[PDB]
Amino acid sequence: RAPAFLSAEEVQDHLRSSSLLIPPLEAALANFSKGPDGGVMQPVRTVVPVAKHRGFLGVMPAYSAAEDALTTKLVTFYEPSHQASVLLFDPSNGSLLAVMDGNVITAKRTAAVSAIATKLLKPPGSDVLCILGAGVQAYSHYEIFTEQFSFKEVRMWNRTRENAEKFASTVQGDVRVCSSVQEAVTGADVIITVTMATEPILFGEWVKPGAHINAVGASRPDWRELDDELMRQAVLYVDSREAALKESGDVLLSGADIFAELGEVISGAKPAHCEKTTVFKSLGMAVEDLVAAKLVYDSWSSG
Amino acid sequence: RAPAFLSAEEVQDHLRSSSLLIPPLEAALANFSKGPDGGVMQPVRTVVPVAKHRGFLGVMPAYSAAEDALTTKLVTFYSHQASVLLFDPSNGSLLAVMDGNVITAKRTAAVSAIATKLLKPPGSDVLCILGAGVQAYSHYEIFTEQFSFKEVRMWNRTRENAEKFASTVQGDVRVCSSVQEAVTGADVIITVTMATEPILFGEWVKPGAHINAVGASRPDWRELDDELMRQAVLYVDSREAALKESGDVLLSGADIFAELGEVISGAKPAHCEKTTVFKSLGMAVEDLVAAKLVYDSWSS
Ligand SMILES: [K+]
Ligand SMILES: [K+]
């Protein structure tokens, strides 16, 4: 029997509520971090180079025993530039139940993991939010952050100012567009770096002590968003230690020590040092995509 | 933006002729065995167990440069259910989601035929099929098309299914009561059984015979005995895959002489006078070739 096909529009209609998405993501992160005691099977991503066209195909299968869900995300990146599809299988008989868009899931799931980390890691008296970058991830983060948290001031810097200005006028609340990374981050309590810089743009010397940084961009071993002082002096949280030590250049080039996985903090195995300067380095994980995709399918197929 | 969805019957409708499928498989096999200069990107398959339901998900992506095609095969083993995704290689765009079962059956049968044209002994008159499932039909269809046998024989663990086969099929098929009766005097043997312990013993095999060993796809299962695996000249589609997945190879300790692609390219000889086994595991680039044929035919 043919699978259902769920377009980007159909996916977004079944993922309007972050409050429905955050809890299973917290469960998934915690379970992943339990490893062999947690029921998640998430093998290393396989990437197949298509050199003749300057492209990559990535494949990210995952199974969650706890939710009883089997998925595979297939993503292509080409120098939209990122295109993703999520496959959802019936875990009891292997049948292919759905092929759905993966871009929306990725935007929403990444923003949601960042919010979870920020809930746990932001300092006392978190009044200022700063966003570095102005693309898809800046929008999805802005959406969930301004609804989950109460910020007095939201600031933005982008490599090209015109795009930050467009962002600012499009979006509902007030956002202060800044001339530099420096101006944007000075006095900021929470920082979101959703950028395509390959060399450090955020320097530890500008960071307010106790600030929390969700570092989302620079998902290659040679690419960095953050300097050595910031990566070495902050308490460093990640989603996956294995993935970070293979894929994150901020981690690898700085030589920084990983304190914990976010899932270890959710489960109580590791403390949330929200008083100290913190970096959450997000790479993304197949089980996060699994969680959102399951949530989309169960919603679509019933209500 | 939405991909095309091709059902099993649509795939079958666009894969009617094996003489269009065989030449690009030959090129793919040779290009895979040439290494990096052959342009084939084929990572080791990723397996995800779902122990709660005693099942597994398998994922096999591939890119071919010669063909300029990009696919991923997703198969659940629990009874194999396969899906093939085909992408626009210049784009990343998902062009099609198609059934993988028909492709699997057609591709495997075509690769056995290629092996058989290269490795069957001189004066090959007798064909023998062990097993009577999906793979037996697809093998029979292409083999009677590609070769002219004086006699075709079959055995299956349940005789009822062997006679049902012999009735459905166009041409005379000798149903045989034992494996031994079926293979003695056989020039070409196809093993596509559900056996997990050796059912074919070297003792019964005519010197020079060619065996296509398609069954026993797990490292703890076998169809053939030690004598056959060690005395035969052993060919495979992929050496890496056989040393990981093939119980007949591992439990015997047999040495692999050549990849089938090396024979096609001229890098290794076809020792067709000697008793030969071709151990077929299946490769992502083999499915990619079939999927590309299908999609281009459908698209036209
Ligand atoms: K903090
Ligand atoms: K032979």
From Swiss-Prot, chain A:
The source's superkingdom equals Eukaryota
Catalysed transformations (reactions): L-pipecolate + NADP(+) = Delta(1)-piperideine-2-carboxylate + NADPH + H(+); L-pipecolate + NAD(+) = Delta(1)-piperideine-2-carboxylate + NADH + H(+); L-proline + NADP(+) = 1-pyrroline-2-carboxylate + NADPH + H(+); L-proline + NAD(+) = 1-pyrroline-2-carboxylate + NADH + H(+)
Q: Where does NADPH bind?
A: S81, H82, R109, A134, V136, Q137, N158, R159, T160, N163, T195, M196, V216, S282
Question: According to its record, what are the GO cellular component terms?
Answer: cytosol; mitochondrion; nucleus
Q: What are the protein's UniProt keywords?
A: Cytoplasm, NAD, NADP, Oxidoreductase
At the top of the EC hierarchy, this enzyme's class is oxidoreductase
Q: Which Gene Ontology terms describe the biological processes this protein takes part in? A: negative regulation of transcription by RNA polymerase II; sensory perception of sound; thyroid hormone metabolic process; thyroid hormone transport
- Enzyme Commission no: 1.5.1.25, 1.5.1.1
Positions of 3,3',5-triiodo-L-thyronine binding = R45, E247
Q: In which tissues is it expressed?
A: Expressed in the spiral ligament of the cochlea (at protein level).
An example molecular function term from Gene Ontology annotations? hormone binding
Q: Which InterPro entries match?
A: NAD(P)-bd_dom_sf (IPR036291), ODC_Mu_crystall (IPR003462), ODC_N (IPR023401)
Cellular location(s): Cytoplasm
Subunit arrangement?
Answer: Homodimer. Binds the thyroid hormone triiodothyronine (T3); T3 binding inhibits enzymatic activity.
State its role.
Catalyzes the NAD(P)H-dependent reduction of imine double bonds of a number of cyclic ketimine substrates, including sulfur-containing cyclic ketimines. Under physiological conditions, it efficiently catalyzes delta(1)-piperideine-2-carboxylate (P2C) and delta(1)-pyrroline-2-carboxylate (Pyr2C) reduction, suggesting a central role in lysine and glutamate metabolism. Additional substrates are delta(2)-thiazoline-2-carboxylate (T2C), 3,4-dehydrothiomorpholine-3-carboxylate (AECK), and (R)-lanthionine ketimine (LK) that is reduced at very low rate compared to other substrates.
Per the similarity annotation, which family is this?
Belongs to the ornithine cyclodeaminase/mu-crystallin family.
**Annotated PANTHER family:** KETIMINE REDUCTASE MU-CRYSTALLIN
Q: What is this protein called?
A: Ketimine reductase mu-crystallin
Q: What species is this protein from?
A: Mus musculus (Mouse)
UniProtKB/Swiss-Prot annotation, chain B:
What does the record give as the reaction this protein catalyses? L-pipecolate + NADP(+) = Delta(1)-piperideine-2-carboxylate + NADPH + H(+); L-pipecolate + NAD(+) = Delta(1)-piperideine-2-carboxylate + NADH + H(+); L-proline + NADP(+) = 1-pyrroline-2-carboxylate + NADPH + H(+); L-proline + NAD(+) = 1-pyrroline-2-carboxylate + NADH + H(+)
Q: Name one Pfam family in it.
A: OCD_Mu_crystall
List the keywords (alphabetical).
Answer: Cytoplasm, NAD, NADP, Oxidoreductase
Q: Which residues bind NADPH?
A: S79, H80, R107, A132, V134, Q135, N156, R157, T158, N161, T193, M194, V214, S280
Expression tissues: Expressed in the spiral ligament of the cochlea (at protein level).
Q: Name one GO molecular function term.
A: NADP binding
Per the record, its GO cellular-component terms are: cytosol; mitochondrion; nucleus
E.C. code: 1.5.1.25, 1.5.1.1
Annotated Gene3D superfamilies: NAD(P)-binding Rossmann-like Domain (3.40.50.720), ornithine cyclodeaminase, domain 1 (3.30.1780.10)
GO biological process: any one? thyroid hormone metabolic process
Binding residues for 3,3',5-triiodo-L-thyronine: R45, E245
Q: Where in the cell is it found?
A: Cytoplasm
Q: How does it assemble?
A: Homodimer. Binds the thyroid hormone triiodothyronine (T3); T3 binding inhibits enzymatic activity.
Function text = Catalyzes the NAD(P)H-dependent reduction of imine double bonds of a number of cyclic ketimine substrates, including sulfur-containing cyclic ketimines. Under physiological conditions, it efficiently catalyzes delta(1)-piperideine-2-carboxylate (P2C) and delta(1)-pyrroline-2-carboxylate (Pyr2C) reduction, suggesting a central role in lysine and glutamate metabolism. Additional substrates are delta(2)-thiazoline-2-carboxylate (T2C), 3,4-dehydrothiomorpholine-3-carboxylate (AECK), and (R)-lanthionine ketimine (LK) that is reduced at very low rate compared to other substrates.
Family per similarity comment? Belongs to the ornithine cyclodeaminase/mu-crystallin family.
Q: What is this protein called?
A: Ketimine reductase mu-crystallin
Give the originating organism.
Mus musculus
What lineage does the source organism belong to?
A: Eukaryota, Metazoa, Chordata, Craniata, Vertebrata
